[PDB]
Design a protein around this nucleic acid. Structure first.
Length: 70
RNA sequence: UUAUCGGCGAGACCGGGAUGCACCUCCCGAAGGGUCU
């Protein structure tokens, strides 16, 4: 069985702290959670609630004027 | 970039019928001939 529980699973999947147990980083300190960032590279790349994610995924913009259809 | 985070998703046959065919001559004329054991 997967070691992750509902709380950890949702933290890693969608960054919602369901159990209310998460490191409440200071609001003004930008580089907060370096320990968490190192320990959990997933929560580092994509953020959790209260920790800015590191991965910025832009939109897929078409390169033409007629490239969509019904 | 006035913060921190979030796939919108899952299922579907669009198919079922039809003859396009029915009528027309393309023909009308001509010498290719003459020079060298």
């Amino acid at each position: 069985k997967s070691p992750f529980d509902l709380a950890e699973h949702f933290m890693l999947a969608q960054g919602v702290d369901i159990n209310g147990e998460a490191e409440t980083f200071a609001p003004g300190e930008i580089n907060a959670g370096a320990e968490l960032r190192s320990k959990n590279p997933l929560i580092s790349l994509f953020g959790r609630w209260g920790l800015s994610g590191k991965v910025g995924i832009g939109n897929a913009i078409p390169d033409g004027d007629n490239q969509w259809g019904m």
